[PDB]
Amino acid sequence: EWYGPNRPQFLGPFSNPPSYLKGEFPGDYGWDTAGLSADPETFARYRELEVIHARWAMLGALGCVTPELLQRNGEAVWFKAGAQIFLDYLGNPSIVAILLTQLVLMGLIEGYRVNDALYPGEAFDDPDTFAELKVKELKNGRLAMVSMLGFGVQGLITRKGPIENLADHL
Amino acid sequence: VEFYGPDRAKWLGPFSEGSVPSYLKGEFPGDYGWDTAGLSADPETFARYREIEVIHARWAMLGALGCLTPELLQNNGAADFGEAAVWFKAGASIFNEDGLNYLGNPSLIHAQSIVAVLLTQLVIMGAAEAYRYSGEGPVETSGDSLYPGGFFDPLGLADDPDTLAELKVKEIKNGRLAMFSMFGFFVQGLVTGKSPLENLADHLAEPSVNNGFASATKFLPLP
Amino acid sequence: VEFYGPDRAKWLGPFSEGSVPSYLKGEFPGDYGWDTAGLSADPETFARYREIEVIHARWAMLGALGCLTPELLQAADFGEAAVWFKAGASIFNEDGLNYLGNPSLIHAQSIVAVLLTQLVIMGAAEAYRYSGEGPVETSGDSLYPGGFFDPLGLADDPDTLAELKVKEIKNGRLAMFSMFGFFVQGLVTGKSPLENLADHLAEPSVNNGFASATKFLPLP
Amino acid sequence: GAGYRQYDALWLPNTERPAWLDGSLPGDRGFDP
């Protein structure tokens, strides 16, 4: 029910989708008010960027959530993480070396990725449930982007861990 | 001074012949040929940006009077707001002991909770903006998503075609001026942290002393 | 770019075409069209000069390498023998020629024996080079013998061989220039080239060649 | 024919000589604004 004219839009009953958002790609909720994806190539690049951002935001949200929650259950804050290296894993016993190693490994893997690119499958893994999982991935990714934006803005303005702010709400 | 066609006024005067893009033919109001970054090559993008620009123009045109008029009212002794006559501290009166009241009179509004007003605004926009996106509703419009007319024109000034075109041009120009002035208000509040009328009075006192370059070393990095 | 034919790179850039001699047709490696004195207008003298230039360039790269390497290895200890021109009298010292610091490798004490052995061996070598034929099988070219002196087969493709010839004449010319610089620096400042480079890098504004300019002034 | 550009030279890179200055006088650069 997420594909075709019966798809759920971002405004609900108000059905005014753009011409180029003809409910074909996953999550086509018909939201383009600035017309930033009129060109099909621009749409393809934007889709790839959105998916990659979704996966990275998922990983970042999980990696920011885990430390402080583990601390409460037995610096822990998400943004004060790289300051410890001036770093034993889980408290269990040179920046240049790690920098070059991470850079070279990341360059290698991303060059391999560049050379379906968006959905390779195979070594990293009914088409109906496959499309359902694609839509679910896209929604979880959008939620992750919103959560990461909120987390960053709170770190800037409150200088405290996000879960600490949640506990102080509660 | 034509504002339409191939012999209109451009954005660089005499030096504007070899800068007008081929897709800006001066058909729509407010056209001056200013497109150097090529952001509206696609016609759909051009239409979307036109809509965004006119809505922004209207909103800023209202916001200019919104940020100004309380200060003029308080300056003439016709009311009393305390410190809310400025634009960037009007939202702090809702947290006051007395609260926020229209015109400073306790019998007008006397609101002291921010959740209720925020919720009412949320519903109001969620209805009205969505109706604008829909393009049709319970009111009578002339079948135009940007200039509905009819119900939205109680006095019916926009009836003649040439008069309508002139009114559109005047609207878009006053909106551009209003957006420029609102950008100025924002930066001037960010930098000097004072009332815009206070800034005008200070400049009019000593034009050569109290100007923009006076607060130049304000944002200087320190070791 | 190009190093052969009428469209090769030359010695004066855009101004080269006005000073290119007729006899310099770019048929040899390292041909840049630089002959303003006409010293090679005779074909035989041109061949002799090419032979002399190539031999001198080879000896120049060898000399530059042998002047640079021992100072870096000092991994060893020599003291006053680190400098290329100060290592000549290290034989006269009553310690032997301690190769790499070990006083057991060659232990050179007398200069007459080494001098005579060098004379005889290099007389034999250079006489065979002048003859060009003997116990060693070569390709027949005096300038580029090959065969035995090419035990890796890098010179098998004629175009690759020409490119290597150009490359190596250029490297030899650079080494020639650097060796002349080494000589002049040794006469002028009396310091090792590495020390000169270190002093230049310390403060290049005042530790340049013009600082030691009045030292040669003839006083009355 | 190298090391420069081949390229009447007036007082401006793109300007026209006035009608009353025909370029016959010695220092005529077409300069009379």
Next chain:
Amino acid sequence: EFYGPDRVKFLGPFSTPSYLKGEYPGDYGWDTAGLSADPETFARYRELEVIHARWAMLGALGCVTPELLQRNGAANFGEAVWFKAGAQIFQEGGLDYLGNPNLVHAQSIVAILLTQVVLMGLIEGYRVNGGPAGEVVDPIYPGEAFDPLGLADDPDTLAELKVKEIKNGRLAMVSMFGFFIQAIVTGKGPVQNLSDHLASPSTDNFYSLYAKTLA
């Protein structure tokens, strides 16, 4: 290389949009977000890139030169540091070029601003329309009166020089961004940072004294 279909890409051997056909200078095939999928927008972006490259080259040279002169004892400027050089107009005697009181002796910022606005607007209008220095044919490569030495005469040399210009301008833009963020972080001069890092590379760097204080 640098042209046609076999030129060097932006990822070396690990590397392409269909509209990047290896015709224009400085094309390494790096367009991932697809902002240049329109030929007109591509032309506009190329023109802005070239203008920005030239301006950034000029800015990098003008940010390096006065402090280098001052620190070597060659001149005594009012404010050698590039981001502090704009406050010389508020000093006692005003702005003096190279420190000489008889060179410029600028005193008023209003006059400076008015003259700069007028001259820049006039020359900008000449650039986009054509004026005393020539008539516009190529919007970014006029030549003629702007190439007196005739270095861009041969088309092959012209293409090579275009590639060199665009690459040196890209490097200048990157270094200018570095200057800005260093000034906004360290608060000292660029060559001062270079000299400090050269004095003790192991201990003097961004991480050792600024990474922890950023957050």
